[model samples]
Target chain A: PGPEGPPG
Target chain B: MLSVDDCFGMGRSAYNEGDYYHTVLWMEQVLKQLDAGEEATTTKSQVLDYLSYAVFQLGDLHRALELTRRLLSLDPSHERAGGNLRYFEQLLEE
Candidate 1:
């Protein structure tokens, strides 16, 4: 899997 | 003085295009900016998220493991980082 997005 | 947002933007762009090479490059710049005291919406935890995965894609399990650990240190509750830490460690063991 890919990395998570930045904190929202 | 590179802006964190710009660096992060470039990294994300590369990541979305499946360009892990540039993803690593730009994400590393984001961290460098952070180290230089440049503040923005991008946090170290976020940068590590991208950096670790990109490094993993580049076949550096050890470095990926290291980055994932660093990410966990910043946010112990990070689900992906938690899972990735285990995954990377398991890969290194085999």
Candidate 2:
């Protein structure tokens, strides 16, 4: 899995 | 002048394509615009999140750690940033 993306 | 949104969009596009190289470029632009007092809908922490992760993918753990620290400073309750901080610190310690 990749790192977290930007917040919404 | 490229708006923060423009830079962020390009950054996110690169990130989604797994192109961390361009991701860092555009994301850094977003940060620079913010620093230069260019207002936008994108927040600093969001930019840092993408920038730090892209830096990590580029194998610059030290820069990643520093950027993550900056992100956490702005958003202390960011769970992923906190975890990444600890992980980066442990890796650098090893």
Candidate 3:
């Protein structure tokens, strides 16, 4: 979880 | 499922969809066999979500507070409530 958000 | 439980959630997302379908359900009941007049508000407990949401959606949250107050009387810790305890308790704030 970082930057824009967590990725799937 | 059509009727399952906490057995199914990877997160809160899945459960919320099922529980919060109440408004859709209550409105369907009102559609049938309902009085063309204010004969009764038999579905009042459940329809509060939709009635409140509609008013809140219109940005008339000041008026919407009346419905929210009615909702809280049914369940003090209700999640369907859509307003602030104080102005500082805003939507999407953490």
Candidate 4:
């Protein structure tokens, strides 16, 4: 949910 | 004769749409279509971790998700999201 995209 | 880009793109699209089961399906196909040793790519690493997310949420397979996350970390230790997700999964187990 952050700027890094999905957890994968 | 689909390219990895197309397959991984479809997988990412399905993930964005929150179609988790289908995301797993497409990503699994992506992994299959990849050549051996090519699975160590960043794209593959991300796909595996994303696939683990769907498996965690939809399938509720915590152990398998952890394994996938570990594999992701092996490929990309600096993957912040994967590390975060692994902690979350651990909390769920606890």
Q: Which structure among the candidates has the greatest TM-score?
A: 2
Residue B79, model 4: lDDT of: 65
The true-versus-predicted C-alpha distance at residue B18 of model 2, in Å, is: 0.7
- lDDT of each residue in B1-94, candidate 4, tens digit only: 5666677878788888888788788878777777444443436676666676666667565654564666566676556556656565676664
lDDT of 2 by residue, B4-87 (tens): 899899999999888999999999889988999987998999899999999988988789889999999999999998888888
Please, what's the RMSD in Å of model 4?
A: 4.2
TM-score, model 3 to reference = 0.39
Give the winner by DockQ. Answer: 2
Q: If the candidates were sorted by their lDDT against the true structure, best first, what order would they fall in?
A: 2, 1, 4, 3
Off by over 4 Å in 3: A1-8, B1-42, B80-94
Q: Worst lDDT window (10 residues) for model 3 chain B?
A: B2-11
Runs of candidate 4 exceeding 4 Å displacement: A1-8, B36-42, B79-94
User: Model 1: runs farther than 4 Å from truth?
Assistant: A1-8
DockQ of each: 0.27, 0.33, 0.04, 0.21
lDDT per residue for candidate 3 within B11-38, as digits (tens), equals: 1232244332343344434433333444
The per-prediction i-RMS, to one decimal, reads 4.1, 3.4, 12.3, 4.8
Clashing pairs in 2: none
- Ranking of all predicted structures according to TM-score, beginning with the best and ending with the worst: 2, 1, 4, 3
Which 10-residue window in model 2 chain B sums to the lowest lDDT? Answer: B85-94
In model 1, the Cα lDDT at residue B12 comes to 91
TM-score of each: 0.87, 0.90, 0.39, 0.64
Query: How high is the lDDT of residue B43 in model 3?
Result: 45
